RNA sequence: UUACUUUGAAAAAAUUAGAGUGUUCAAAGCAGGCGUAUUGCUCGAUAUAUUAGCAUGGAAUAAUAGUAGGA
RNA sequence: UCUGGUUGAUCCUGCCAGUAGUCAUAUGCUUGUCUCAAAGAUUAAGCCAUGCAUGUCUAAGUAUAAGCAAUUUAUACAGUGAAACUGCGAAUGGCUCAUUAAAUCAGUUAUCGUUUAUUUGAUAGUUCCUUACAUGGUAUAACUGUGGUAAUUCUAGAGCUAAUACAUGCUAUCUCGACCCUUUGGAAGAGAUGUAUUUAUUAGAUAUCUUCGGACUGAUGAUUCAUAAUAACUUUUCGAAUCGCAUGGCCUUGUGCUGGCGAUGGUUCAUUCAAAUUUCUGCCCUAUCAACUUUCGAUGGUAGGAUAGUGGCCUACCAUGGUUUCAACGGGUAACGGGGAAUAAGGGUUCGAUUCCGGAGAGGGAGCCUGAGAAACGGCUACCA
């Protein structure tokens, strides 16, 4: 359901005229986040309300773009990915494995499972630790 | 007193960050203006840049807009009914954003009479309005959502609650009573 | 610091000023103005260290308060005014106009200029926009706001500006095959024709340039500056015409 | 808050400063050329050391580089 | 170093206050003078030896009654 | 597809390594000089991924994806 | 990194002898010239006598100084100019490294997430709308005088008088155009017309004849962007009651109408000097430190408050999350970070308070005023020493 909270969830400044009777009983606003990211038809014809969905919310995707492997999906509307990389120790002339767990928001227009490869884009600080936004999910 | 830096919180990993500097002026906070309902009384705060910012301590009237008719009238705010953050604000009659107040309805029904040639209660397709809105007109107060930030601009401007929001907040009021 | 700096050390200064490192601790911090800090020449640096028309900052004050120096048609009296790139500096008693333009070695270059060439000035249209009351304007690379431009003027396009009226005389599009001056980066001062704009989204668009000895290099769109068509520079280039050699 | 003038040491003591062959070498040089100092002979030997090191590296690099 | 021995703690009054608060909140994970120490240890050993002496004497009394 | 490699842009000056120059030599310091100056002539002013990011060329190596059945 | 010594001579293992430098740290003796140059250290970022280190005026904000110059065109002022009001600056510079170990910092990004004095370029006729604009009104300083006090850059009562102080405030242009007669158009008539704050709504989309002469919105990779329009709202802004030099053009001869150069100011937008957040990756020793964070916000969701603005920044109500054997957390650091300095063949190792860049601090907790800019300390307040 959509109205599961104390306030009325809505798209701000988007107004559906009650005296005007149309087919689609709501008026939904959606954009495309650029950079060749196909906006999903579930976000076009969905019913959720999300301030931080990069296709429907007031959040721009800009600057850096990362890809990662999802690790945990237990909190509401945010996941945690794990980027892995090889650091180079010039003394021993060889490498070592490291990792950084970057938490990242996920729109309700996406279905992630623990183990797939997602593509995230940097947005303005959503929360204390969430600066990225999931924009293209891929299976594994 | 208030400051809003992020150097006094725990780390993301769950560590305690030691202090890095004294508190700075560009991360100040100020004391909330618990704006209540009374005669108009408004402070002016000087803000970064030289910019004025009006705080409201008590404000009676307000500007409320009927969205379905696209008009706006100045009405008198009666009292706060619902507020999704704190029923203590509901109790103490605090005027903030997203509050649900009851307003006077006489200027709206006067405009309706002078515009559609028809009274309320008791061009016909244009004259037809919603049933709950007609019930509120018969009652004498209208439900309206405040959409201004009266601790920042000092204005209480809102819009009259239209169909879907009125249904949701009517369910909320009746369930919470 | 708790506010804006007002001092510039000698070694902190931009390198291309050719300020020698023993004559003091401070270099003329160029006041806020049309041009950015790291690519501006103050009038004290120009009149003293380059033209040798002054021996002291007090003589530069004497000249400017005598009101001889004019920078783009108007009298300046602030001795650290930031006279930048593609500038017209006219000294009337000496009967000289100077186009300020870069040399091949990466430094600024006095360019003696006649009256009919000093009468105008190029400017890189950099931000085209729609202002209040619905009028359009262009913002060139020296802060010059010009309302009511031609409808075909886009970003990164050169506009030849008549100085004494502040108006747009004409303009030069940004296509492949135009003559491109490069202003920042490693290759600044190398005049070459633009071959190909390698265009990325969200990144920086690079530009492949090829100059008269058919040498090829890559810069960014921020450093590219269009001058004119093939073999027809609208301005008169300095000696060597911008060619880096061995 | 000035810029530092650069200074440089012009000579350098050799590896083994006491050695009979080199002592007689410097005696021959000083008495023959009218010098006064192991400081002077080390000045010249330092210049020549720098020159010959540069030349050796340019030898080891490729011809027509 | 966070917990050193400074020169003037009487001037570092508030410094020591915030350092002690920091130490408490940090090592909440763990919590949740030597000459005097020698005299304390030898005092404990002496009084314990005297208790051993008294219990020894009353066990001697016990056995001499029980014979 | 990536690692890895090549090249390019980027990596403030000072410092370092180099080129010129008779500071009287030197440690230093600095960045043209001549003309029929009414249209020209001459030389030097270069380099410094060491990891991350950006763009690009790959034929190996090391991971990494993707033919089958029936009538 | 090597050399000497055992034995008739020889080889390895051994033992001893021998060797090193160090803008390293103290110290001793000597010290004539020329050029150049530094000038911290008790893990004491411990304490200060005195002196100085931040003020400022152009022709152009305010002079009736009972200041000076007389004096020659100046009976409002006109030269120069103390004092004081006003404006700006004092937030830069200078010193030190105490704190801080993904913190500062280096390289790389972002602001489609914000403020910006100044500089620079643009920018505002709104004509009317029922009962002074040849230019409204108050004060106050300095000053005169009466005083207090051991004392300080202490100031009280009383009488003046100014402003670019403070507070008030009024002064046609487009579109269509029947006609007419045709050019060089001019015309009855119809119609419209500031910014600023706040809210609501809307737009901001783009897969045939000839008199040969004429008729049949933008940008980005992307936006709720720029911009425009509607209806109201405001203890509500702005739309010049300012200043210097000169004196020309007109003529209904009014002391009438007009007029040059330039100084200060002012709404918005852009620019510049900035500022605050911000993405990736990179820190020395410690596992005889293995679990840590959440009442007291730890991780996320929704709404609000607050801020210049994003954001658990904070308050509610909610879910139980977040980090780690790839070393979390906590401990030590005689730990400011970097460019850089020394050394060896390469690899590395050790220094870097110290001429440049950045951050932090002004005996130590805390708090604020003014201002575009400060949590300022050669600013103010309370506590401790």
Curated annotation (Swiss-Prot), chain B:
Xref: Pfam families: Ribosomal_S8e (PF01201)
CDD domains per the UniProt record, alphabetical: Ribosomal_S8e_like
Cleavable signal peptide: none
GO molecular function, one term: structural constituent of ribosome
Top-level taxon in the UniProt lineage: Eukaryota
This protein's UniProt keywords: Cytoplasm, Phosphoprotein, Ribonucleoprotein, Ribosomal protein
PROSITE patterns: RIBOSOMAL_S8E (PS01193)
GO CC aspect terms: 90S preribosome; cytosol; cytosolic small ribosomal subunit
Modification sites for Phosphoserine: 65, 68, 72, 85, 131-132, 135, 138
Localization (cell): Cytoplasm
Chief site of localization: cytoplasm
UniProt-listed GO biological process terms: maturation of SSU-rRNA from tricistronic rRNA transcript (SSU-rRNA, 5.8S rRNA, LSU-rRNA); translation
Region: Disordered, residue numbers: 1-30
Phosphothreonine sites (modified residues): 61, 106
Note: Present with 15900 molecules/cell in log phase SD medium.
PANTHER family given in the database record: 40S RIBOSOMAL PROTEIN S8
Quaternary structure and interacting proteins, as annotated: Component of the small ribosomal subunit (SSU). Mature yeast ribosomes consist of a small (40S) and a large (60S) subunit. The 40S small subunit contains 1 molecule of ribosomal RNA (18S rRNA) and 33 different proteins (encoded by 57 genes). The large 60S subunit contains 3 rRNA molecules (25S, 5.8S and 5S rRNA) and 46 different proteins (encoded by 81 genes).
Family: Belongs to the eukaryotic ribosomal protein eS8 family.
Name the UniProt record assigns to this protein: Small ribosomal subunit protein eS8A
Species: Saccharomyces cerevisiae (strain ATCC 204508 / S288c) (Baker's yeast)
Gene from which the chain derives: RPS8A
Swiss-Prot record, chain C:
Annotated ranges, domain S4 RNA-binding: 41-104
Cellular compartment(s): Cytoplasm
An example molecular function term from Gene Ontology annotations: rRNA binding
Major subcellular location class: cytoplasm
PROSITE patterns according to UniProt: RIBOSOMAL_S4E, S4
Residue positions, PTM Phosphothreonine: 114
GO biological process, one term: translation
Xref: Pfam families: 40S_S4_C (PF16121), KOW (PF00467), Ribosomal_S4e (PF00900), RS4NT (PF08071), S4 (PF01479)
Disulfide linkage: none
Keywords on record: Cytoplasm, Isopeptide bond, Phosphoprotein, Ribonucleoprotein, Ribosomal protein, RNA-binding, rRNA-binding, Ubl conjugation
UniProt cross-references to InterPro entries, sorted A to Z: KOW, Rib_uL2_dom2, Ribosomal_eS4, Ribosomal_eS4_C, Ribosomal_eS4_central_region, Ribosomal_eS4_central_sf, Ribosomal_eS4_KOW, Ribosomal_eS4_N
Residues annotated with Phosphoserine modification: 31, 246
Lineage: superkingdom: Eukaryota
Crosslink feature (Glycyl lysine isopeptide (Lys-Gly) (interchain with G-Cter in ubiquitin)) location: 61, 133, 160, 167, 173, 178, 210, 232
GO cellular component: 90S preribosome; cytoplasm; cytosol; cytosolic small ribosomal subunit
UniProt subunit comment: Component of the small ribosomal subunit (SSU). Mature yeast ribosomes consist of a small (40S) and a large (60S) subunit. The 40S small subunit contains 1 molecule of ribosomal RNA (18S rRNA) and 33 different proteins (encoded by 57 genes). The large 60S subunit contains 3 rRNA molecules (25S, 5.8S and 5S rRNA) and 46 different proteins (encoded by 81 genes).
Miscellaneous field: Present with 573 molecules/cell in log phase SD medium. There are 2 genes for eS4 in yeast.
Family: Belongs to the eukaryotic ribosomal protein eS4 family.
HAMAP family, alphabetized: Ribosomal_eS4
Identification of the protein by name: Small ribosomal subunit protein eS4A
Organism: Saccharomyces cerevisiae (strain ATCC 204508 / S288c) (Baker's yeast)
Gene that this sequence comes from: RPS4A
Curated annotation (Swiss-Prot), chain D:
Location relative to the cell: Cytoplasm; Nucleus, Nucleolus
Protein origin, superkingdom: Eukaryota
Signal peptide limits: none
Protein's job: Component of the ribosome, a large ribonucleoprotein complex responsible for the synthesis of proteins in the cell. The small ribosomal subunit (SSU) binds messenger RNAs (mRNAs) and translates the encoded message by selecting cognate aminoacyl-transfer RNA (tRNA) molecules. The large subunit (LSU) contains the ribosomal catalytic site termed the peptidyl transferase center (PTC), which catalyzes the formation of peptide bonds, thereby polymerizing the amino acids delivered by tRNAs into a polypeptide chain.
Note: Present with 106000 molecules/cell in log phase SD medium.
Assembly behavior: Component of the small ribosomal subunit (SSU). Mature yeast ribosomes consist of a small (40S) and a large (60S) subunit. The 40S small subunit contains 1 molecule of ribosomal RNA (18S rRNA) and 33 different proteins (encoded by 57 genes). The large 60S subunit contains 3 rRNA molecules (25S, 5.8S and 5S rRNA) and 46 different proteins (encoded by 81 genes). Interacts with snoRNA U3. uS11 interacts with MPP10. Component of the ribosomal small subunit (SSU) processome composed of at least 40 protein subunits and snoRNA U3.
Protein family: Belongs to the universal ribosomal protein uS4 family.
Protein name as catalogued: Small ribosomal subunit protein uS4A
Whole-protein coverage range: 2 to 66 of 197
Curated annotation (Swiss-Prot), chain E:
Compositionally biased intervals (Basic and acidic residues): 6-24
Localization annotation: Nucleus, Nucleolus
Note: Present with 2000 molecules/cell in log phase SD medium.
Family, as annotated: Belongs to the DEAD box helicase family. DEAH subfamily.
Record's function text: Probable ATP-binding RNA helicase. Required for 18S rRNA synthesis. May play a role in restructuring of the pre-rRNA.
Oligomer status and interactors: Interacts with snoRNA U3. Component of the ribosomal small subunit (SSU) processome composed of at least 40 protein subunits and snoRNA U3.
Name of this protein: Probable ATP-dependent RNA helicase DHR1
Species in which this protein is naturally found: Saccharomyces cerevisiae (strain ATCC 204508 / S288c)
Lineage: Eukaryota, Fungi, Dikarya, Ascomycota, Saccharomycotina
